[PDB]
Symmetry: D2
């Protein structure tokens, strides 16, 4: 068949070992009538991929180990390789450049039929991004321009997450924006905050190289979230508290700092995957009654793929995609991932 | 001058005494050019009035005792008694039935000029509701129909709070609504949830007489918030978790129960005044990341007075105003208040 | 097979004959794996059904005559009679009470994947409402309560149209509402305007019996749209121009009158199917620049079915469904339809 | 007193003469307690100023000629020169850089107290922009940064109009935008469409130099609105019809072309001042029923001043302000205005 990567182990806390990723052989998949097979050209690696591997997994930890070796990868671009007859009839053709949405909506539960497909009750997940060929239902497949640079469109899915979070934070003309975390999603939020009219953008992180990267992506200020007094410096710099707070570190200290930074009537969005003891103490009197704060979550996003595809030419990923490796050299890619030095890493899957 | 009530003491925790209200003599107030004097006909008593008196007041407790005896009352209807020359020019005339907004916006700070007058930086408060005559700036004075029953329009201000909270919870066609607290604001939210298309309305309280009152105001279900298992019964009755949660008890257990009841993508609104240790622990992973919950505060409301005045004929206050006393018998009114038995109490101020 | 009604002719303007409806024999349909067959119990007849038959059809007129005899009917309730294997797996079972959505979304065009399924590019329409058994894709089938009165749930689809139009007009607390047309959709908008907090509701029609029906459904005022001066009486009665205008007659005079009634910053919604020369002259200077009016269209609605199903117990259809006939007596039902006397007519399909 | 410009004549159609602007002497104005006197440093000239002078004025034409010589100018920046005692108490001080809002809201009519101050019933207008010193109520005066370049902040008011129109057109991530008119407001909409995430921006005008200017301000395409076939080229270039249409020419042909360009479910905003016979024929069937178009007006904007002030550093006015003259040379400025060659002209008022 073909080359595919699988998660072979996850973080073992009672031996102190990290998770592993290994290439195995897999048979060539075949599409049914409504399905489409992609030849994958670029796949990107995500923070959730890293959490599976190096992360603290909750009651969920037993279940996942249950099913290793596990296919993964949900951020990918490539070219249609083969089309079922129904899909051909809906216009999909071999040779079309596309991206795929890992999530399969059932279209016949209540959430689905209220438009809330990201809350689908019979949600399917097709996680074969890190495969040379992958099959999806035609509803998951989205065309992109014929002249598209596939490397950048591999980031379509994480851009949807960033777009949903920005929209949920209500970034708009003249607002001040605080972004917790200078990772890949962070850098996309910086760019999107600019493209939503934000007049002040401040990024917070521990790592100083990443603060420099935030400024390169368009942030006005970039601050160390570990230095004490940081809240007041930040409020000073923005002339007041922040209208929009976006929490992407998944850490409870950043989350609490986010809430503190939030202006009266402001919108805070917690979109990271959180770990153990993930409590945000909200003060009913001061945060809510006196300050009228709005605290939101964010799961998956819905209906964002076409939008995201339209935004790609407005984004500059030369400031976000910081490493590219070949599938052959996947081992180095995952070393780079585990280093946590890089905003986004892509793998070129046909090499 | 005239009869007016003042708060003469507040809750003394280091002697275990309750707050007191006493009538004193006060001079007749006189309006400047832009001001208007009202002859007050009905005044209503509020939950915040009760918190001053019988309540736990925080670092705020020293400040308030600083300034006793203190005028109070912010829910009132009556008739214009005298008009400054500028106000007459804006159309206000002696004999007009009106209600007053206690809050005075400065109109020249940033919040004011962003439309967020409820967050005014130089906020003024005119708290002389429990006075036979009171003066306000013309911007605070709102006319009501010539044939209006003044008793019901005394509830205009608390209806604005209820309207803002309902709107913030996004009550709309086909949503399920959970209301924590079967007090006056609670009963108004029941009526307003009906008038916003809610298809399931469940009220929660400790007191059983109040649960009966909720059903009389239009609630579908009324449940005891102290009985264990109540969450699951409630979710059973509504066929699922609640789209809209409205927290008006000011208690942290009701607040936590509210969050638990809240559906995925639901809106919870915390509009009560909270007491000591008012912490809502929010789980970032389950409440926010997985469930996409929206948690909101609510302070004062903005631009709601004309709306509220238009809604009065749609409301039925015969199910909410449960006691009327004369100003002469104010002492019984405040006994009734301290009993906490009644949804709303009104005082007729010209008797 | 079974009994089914078909449109056998449409309005012939060059002979002055009306359209006809006739029962024919049809084979029993069979569901594929993802399909479901309904035994139809109640079917309702619509204004669009009447326009096909007695109406002026545009360039569209040649196309439709092309394909007579034509199945029709898109408003129906009944019971699941047979389930394909995939659908059974998604939980649909014989014996379940359901309603059907005539519209089939493809789920793989751009509108579909932006959430705008009512603008689907490969839209399918299953118009076999007036059939004893009909087949639909499982995505079109919605369950209703086990104890549901099927007669009322036959109106689920037109309630979705009414719900979308009300939402598009932004009916909400304290708004004034003008509804053009006292037909079935009109009566549903009256009820929905009440359930959205409207403080003034005025219905306009030519026919006086229908104005009485508007008052019975909850309208505050009901006026004759042909009497001259009607606009000013209406504005008088509402204390001003209308915040929400809903145009359901499909006539250009009602449409123009609607725009005139509309308040500054108001929302007018044109949701009827219009005939020949359907021009609304909008004055850029007075309607738009000075008055800041918002003029909207409305096609089909999207994601409204679950909502509508939840609203049914809040509606009172004893004031809307004014005639019920048996399928056997369909000929009288269509006479009643062509009379235009009745708000809604239902046919009981198993008799 | 001081130098001030007045409109001395308007367009005389029954002699074919244009309007005139002349400097006269005016006394120094004095602020009351709540007022503030500005020393004006920069004033900008507007399209409405040009319509008074060279324009077709309707039934309004007799009224305006009634009151010549008339003060004008409503786009200005400068420095506080003197403060009434109440205003000083609200924090305004001599030496503060500011801009002024010409519009005075009464704060005590129904529109005002519903938040719709741009629809104020007792609206006041202070049109003395083209004066060396002007007085306004403190509510009209907005501070800007101490280091602000006053020339650019003179454009605060027209930016508010552009911001309101953009918001009303719902410009947001991934939308296509059509702007009719490559004037100053046009160029600001180009910049704002970029800063709201628009993925395609096309400007339409007659004049080719102005089309080049649109491309310099960030438009993707710039097309001649007089060339036939232009609609289809534009739809070709954008891959479909436009989500957002903004009509700023005030001409009925551009308005009609705008509606034609508008996508299904799109938002068109007509914010220009229109002339004689300003009719937009809307087709109820095709524009509204089938296409679900949304057509909006726009008057003044509300609560936009602080926002606009925050956006100024995000805008680049070196591509918009194309001429600066001294008050001394005002005659050339108005020649430049009447030439209609330039996007925006500013006058430096202390020279
Ligand atoms: Cl703040
Ligand atoms: Cl929200
Ligand atoms: Cl849920
Ligand atoms: Cl109006
Ligand atoms: Cl379109
Ligand atoms: Cl809208
Ligand atoms: Zn589903
Ligand atoms: Zn991802
Ligand atoms: Zn203020
Ligand atoms: Zn109150
Ligand atoms: Zn489709
Ligand atoms: Zn229908
Ligand atoms: Zn006003
Ligand atoms: Zn202007």
């Amino acid at each position: 068949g073909m080359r595919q990567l699988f998660v072979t182990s996850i973080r073992d806390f009672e031996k102190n070992t990290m998770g592993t990723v290994d290439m195995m052989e897999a048979p060539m998949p075949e599409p049914k009538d409504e399905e489409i097979r992609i030849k994958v050209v670029y796949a990107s690696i995500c923070g959730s991929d890293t959490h599976i591997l190096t992360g603290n997994l909750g009651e969920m930890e037993s279940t996942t180990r249950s099913m290793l070796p596990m296919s993964f990868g949900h951020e990918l671009s490539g070219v249609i390789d083969k089309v079922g007859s129904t899909a051909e009839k809906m216009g999909f053709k071999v040779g079309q450049k596309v991206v795929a949405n890992y999530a399969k909506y059932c279209g016949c539960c209540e959430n689905c039929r209220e438009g809330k497909v990201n809350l689908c009750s019979n949600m399917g997940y097709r996680m074969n991004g890190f495969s040379e060929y992958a099959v999806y239902h035609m509803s998951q497949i989205f065309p992109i321009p014929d002249d598209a640079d596939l490397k950048d469109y591999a980031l379509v899915e994480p851009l949807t997450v960033a777009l949903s979070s920005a929209e949920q934070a209500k970034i708009s003309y003249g607002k001040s924006v605080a972004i917790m975390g200078a990772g890949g999603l962070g850098m996309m939020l910086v760019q999107l905050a600019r493209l939503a009219g934000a007049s002040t953008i401040t990024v917070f992180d521990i790592v100083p190289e990443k603060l420099e990267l935030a400024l390169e992506n368009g942030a006005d200020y970039a601050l160390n979230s570990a230095e004490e007094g940081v809240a007041e410096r930040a409020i000073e710099l923005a002339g007041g508290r922040y209208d929009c707070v976006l929490e992407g570190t998944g850490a409870t200290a950043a989350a609490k700092l986010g809430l503190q930074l939030l202006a009266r009537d402001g919108d805070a969005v917690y979109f990271a995957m959180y770990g153990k003891d993930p409590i945000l103490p909200v003060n009913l009197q001061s945060d809510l009654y006196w300050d009228q704060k709005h605290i939101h979550g964010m799961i998956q996003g819905a209906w964002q793929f076409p939008k995201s595809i339209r935004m790609i030419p407005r984004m500059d990923f030369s400031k976000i995609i910081q490493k590219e490796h070949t599938l052959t050299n996947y081992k180095q890619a995952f070393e780079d991932l585990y280093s946590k030095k890089y905003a986004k890493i892509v793998i070129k899957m046909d090499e």
